[PDB]
């Protein structure tokens, strides 16, 4: 970027940093000066310190970049032109219930979720010392230039994610300072670029004297892209070897980095940085950028170039469709239509592009025939640039991913010109160990799952990727040390419920849509990123399983079966608490014998998940569409009531009694009047065979069972069938 622009960015990110220094310090001095002075302590930059000092606006004069940062500050919040801690987003999300608040912490990879509590309202200076020093330390010796930007962002992400933008205001109480500053910088640069393109240099006139006139002026694009084909690409493995498993985790991480590299190469073909980008998703991304003709032409051409790259390498398997919409400040608290309809223009441009994909020429060339190929890649059925690898036949892509699966346990990934897996126009993706960095030359470097800034000044990404053993061993690991348990491995697929609806209008119910801002939604996105890309790994800890895909959109995890069910349950109940009950998951859990292929499990478990979404969307489906229960009552009723009772009685019984489980199963599948009689008969028969220690407890249980089986309401006997199943799987040798 131009120097003038670099300074604008830093100004906008760093204004209202006084609030932190001053919350720790507690000085009776206004934050504009605390901030600005402290910045002057550690670096010499008049334009920057100026935007901190006079962000307050203070007619010192000039047509300073301060006048930009000011108006962007106002737009970056719902508010227009005693003390409490940060508020849960889920306070004003959905119905009015209890209000919860966030104790300010710094982000650690290893950590349980930083839950809001209703008893953290009161502000305390203590909590800030930890933070402010960590900030000032890291900015002490710190060059404010282009290449430093993606590290400072991460710093703000790490320390200020739970520091509120304002200590005393109810309107933006819940908007973290990290997001507010980030958003401020986004609009600062976007604005700057708008007036650059339209020649306007009187900032003091336009954004200040005309302040309310500009808010009407459509200077912004909400832009988006969607990378189609990802799930089918990751999970379509037609090999069942040990080796082929490597490809799964590989493919996953690959495309995660593809969506990232699209984001980054786009933002710098434009003049912007990652602060302009709201979210990076399941191969989705949303950006705020200037509404000019330059920017639109760069989007159009970019997209053309990328689908060119994608065509060359993956044929029709991967496609990326962009879309943008135009707006002015219509994210400031018709508000129903306006805020929703800015996202709708890109949404709709993308759908139209996805539904008429290519032109005459590229179809002509795809159908050019000309091959006569005896063989294909065993993994993906490609006939393109085959190679021998390990005495099997694969494409150079699949070969490339075999290589990548070796680089995958590093922390750092670089963007080479030709070294590694193709990631884009004249770019490749290579994981490399730290030492080797100096020995390679690279466009950009990412560090994966590290909040600490490093010597190599890297862009920070966060993937949830827990691994314990390998997929081909998970099924065998389900057998106990005593040889107990069915030898199967399981998959889980789970999804937030009506996530789209939350992102767009979840804040409309309370108030009347006054709480539906852009900032609010941004903060929502961060909540779900955090939950699904950081905290998810902790729920996986000490469990024999691997998280292959993780996001609010889609979570995919495969492991041994008892640990997968434990993982699902731990994940969900954390999610309900984290969300304060205002949002749910549905999940389905597949159960398969060793060596069934990846494609198959993914597909069948996807079907199970849709059955689960098939209830009123709060359900979980395990091993068959028939066993589908509201999560709440599977947890409370199947998992830790009926199953604990069953376990308790039958762990005492011998082979002869354990056999009755089969009868009970049958009778549950054949529910009819007469089989109630038979149920009673074999129940009392069992009671007879049971030892006298449990005779009393078993009396209670026996009659309870017949209760379930006699209810005209079938819910309890369904739960019964499934718990007896769980039990049998649980004991089998």
């Amino acid at each position: 970027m131009k120097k003038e622009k670099i300074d604008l960015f830093y100004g906008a990110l760093l204004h209202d940093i006084g609030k932190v220094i001053q919350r720790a310090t507690g000085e009776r001095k206004k934050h504009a000066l605390v901030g600005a002075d402290w910045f002057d302590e550690i670096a010499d930059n008049q334009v920057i310190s100026d935007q901190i000092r006079y962000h307050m606006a203070d007619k010192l004069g000039n047509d300073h970049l301060a006048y930009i940062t000011y108006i962007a500050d106002n737009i970056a919040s719902g508010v227009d032109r005693t003390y409490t801690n940060q508020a849960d987003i889920f306070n004003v999300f959905g119905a009015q219930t209890d209000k919860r608040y966030f104790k300010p912490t710094v982000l650690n990879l290893k950590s349980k979720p930083n839950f809001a509590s209703a008893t953290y309202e009161p502000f305390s200076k203590g909590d800030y010392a930890a933070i402010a020093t960590r900030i000032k330390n890291e900015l002490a010796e710190f060059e404010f230039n282009q290449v430093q930007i993606d590290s400072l962002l991460n710093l703000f992400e790490a320390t200020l994610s739970f520091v509120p933008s304002s200590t005393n205001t109810k309107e933006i109480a819940d908007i973290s300072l990290a997001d507010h500053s980030r958003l401020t910088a986004a609009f600062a640069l976007a604005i700057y670029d708008y007036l650059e393109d339209k020649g306007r240099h009187n900032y003091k006139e336009d954004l200040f004297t005309k302040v309310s006139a500009f808010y009407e002026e459509e200077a912004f694009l909400l832009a988006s892209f969607d990378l189609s084909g990802i799930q089918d690409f990751i999970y379509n493995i037609n090999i069942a070897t040990n080796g082929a498993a490597k490809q799964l985790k590989a493919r996953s991480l690959y495309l995660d980095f593809m969506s990232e590299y699209i984001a980054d190469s786009l933002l710098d073909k434009l003049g912007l940085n990652r602060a302009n980008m709201l979210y990076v998703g399941g191969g989705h991304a949303y950006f705020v950028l200037a509404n000019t003709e330059k920017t639109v032409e760069t989007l159009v051409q970019f997209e053309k170039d990328f689908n060119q790259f994608l065509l060359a390498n993956f044929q029709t398997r991967l496609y990326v469709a962009f879309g943008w919409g135009s707006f002015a400040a219509k994210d400031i608290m018709n508000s129903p239509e306006s805020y929703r309809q800015v996202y709708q223009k890109a949404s709709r441009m993308i759908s139209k592009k996805k539904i008429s994909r290519y032109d005459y020429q590229t179809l002509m060339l795809l159908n050019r025939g000309g091959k006569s190929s005896e063989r294909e890649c065993e993994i993906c059925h490609s006939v393109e640039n085959l190679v021998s690898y390990h005495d099997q036949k694969v494409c150079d892509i699949c070969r490339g991913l075999y290589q990548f699966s070796k680089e995958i346990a590093h922390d750092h990934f670089i963007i080479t010109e030709n070294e590694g897996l193709p990631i884009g126009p004249n770019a490749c993706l290579k994981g490399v160990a730290f030492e080797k960095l100096s020995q390679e030359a690279f466009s950009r470097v990412y560090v994966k799952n590290d909040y600490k800034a490093g010597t190599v000044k890297a862009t920070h990404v966060f993937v949830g990727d827990y691994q314990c053993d390998e997929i081909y061993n998970y099924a065998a690991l389900s057998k106990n040390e005593n040889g107990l348990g069915i030898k199967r491995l399981a998959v889980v697929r789970l999804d937030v419920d009506d996530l789209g609806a939350a992102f767009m209008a979840g804040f409309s119910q309370q108030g009347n849509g006054q709480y539906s801002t852009l900032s609010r939604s941004a903060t929502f996105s961060r909540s779900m990123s955090l939950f699904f890309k950081v905290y998810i790994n902790q729920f996986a800890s000490d469990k024999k399983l691997s998280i292959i895909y993780a996001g609010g959109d889609d979570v995919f995890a495969i492991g041994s079966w008892q640990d997968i069910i434990a993982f699902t349950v731990e994940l969900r109940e954390n999610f309900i608490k984290w969300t304060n009950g205002k949002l749910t998951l549905s999940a389905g859990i597949g159960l398969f014998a060793d060596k069934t292929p990846i494609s198959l499990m993914a597909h069948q478990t996807g079907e199970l998940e849709e059955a689960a979404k098939g209830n009123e969307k709060d359900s979980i489906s395990l091993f068959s569409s028939d066993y589908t229960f509201k999560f709440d009552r599977f947890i409370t009723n199947v998992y830790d009531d009926k199953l604990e009772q069953i376990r308790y009685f039958f762990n005492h019984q011998d082979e002869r009694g354990k056999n009755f489980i089969y009868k009970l199963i049958e009778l549950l599948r054949n529910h009819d009047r007469m089989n109630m009689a038979r149920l009673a008969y074999y129940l009392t028969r069992l009671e007879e065979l049971t030892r006298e220690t449990d005779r009393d407890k078993f009396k209670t249980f026996k009659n309870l069972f017949y209760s379930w089986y006699t209810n005209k309401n079938d819910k309890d006997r369904k739960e019964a069938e499934l718990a007896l199943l769980l039990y049998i799987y649980e004991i089998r040798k």
């Binding site: 069915i486 597949g590 159960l591 398969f592 014998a593 069948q604 091993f623 068959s624 082979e655 056999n659 089969y662 199963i665 049958e666 599948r669 199943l725 049998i728 799987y729 089998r732």
Partner: protein, 219 residues
């Protein structure tokens, strides 16, 4: 000679309990240890065509292969012509089309007051030195279940001599199934099977079936 399609039809009667066995996750559900392959919509036992074809082929290899073959591509042209050979341009598809056989008499049994169409057979194992017993349950489709059987023979590039020999092979195949079992725990009394009301019918083209029908009813 002209093109024609002959349908071999019968009712397979289970003379003893049959176990083929569940792979389909629907039919894999562990409510019993060793389940049997079942048609998902009716949850009745089913005799997969792949089972019939496979077993009949490997039986017929013992008779009609001059040299015992490692791989099925090495089977004799007489078997390859009927069951197909993926590595031979002439026989890439055999002249036989098997059909999954389905339970015919479900209604007969429902009327007789039968309840399940599968029994759960208890077996055990005796340690040879310790004499302790390890018990075992495994499902069978009940005996005297019947299944509608259909096999298609295509007459294309055969000389009438050749179709005669093919018919010999098919009759040997069925008899050999009768004097063996349909894949189960066969050695221990499982898969015994009978073809009742065994009949040939020309369902396409003209061929004359009289002498074949005689020869089937007598073997």
């Amino acid at each position: 000679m002209t093109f024609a399609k002959i349908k071999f039809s019968a009712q397979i009667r289970l003379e003893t309990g049959l176990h083929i066995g569940g792979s389909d996750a629907f039919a894999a559900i562990g409510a019993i240890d060793s389940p049997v392959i079942k048609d998902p919509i009716t949850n009745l036992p089913i005799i997969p065509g792949s089972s019939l074809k496979g077993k009949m082929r490997t039986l017929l290899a013992k008779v009609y292969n001059e040299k015992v073959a490692e791989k099925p591509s090495d089977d004799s042209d007489i078997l390859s012509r009927l069951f197909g050979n993926s590595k031979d341009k002439r026989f890439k598809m055999g002249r036989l089309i098997f059909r999954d056989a389905f339970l015919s008499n479900a209604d007969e049994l429902d009327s007789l007051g039968v309840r399940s169409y599968t029994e759960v057979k208890f077996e055990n194992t005796i340690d040879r030195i310790t004499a302790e017993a390890n018990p075992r349950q495994i499902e069978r489709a009940i005996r005297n279940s019947t299944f509608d059987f259909e096999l298609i023979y295509e007459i294309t590039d055969e000389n009438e001599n050749q179709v005669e020999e093919d018919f010999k092979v098919i009759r040997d195949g069925l008899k050999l199934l009768e004097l063996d079992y349909l894949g189960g725990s066969g050695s221990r009394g499982y898969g015994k099977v009978a073809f009742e009301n065994l009949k040939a019918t020309t369902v396409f083209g003209n061929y004359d079936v009289k002498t074949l029908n005689e020869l089937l009813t007598a073997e």
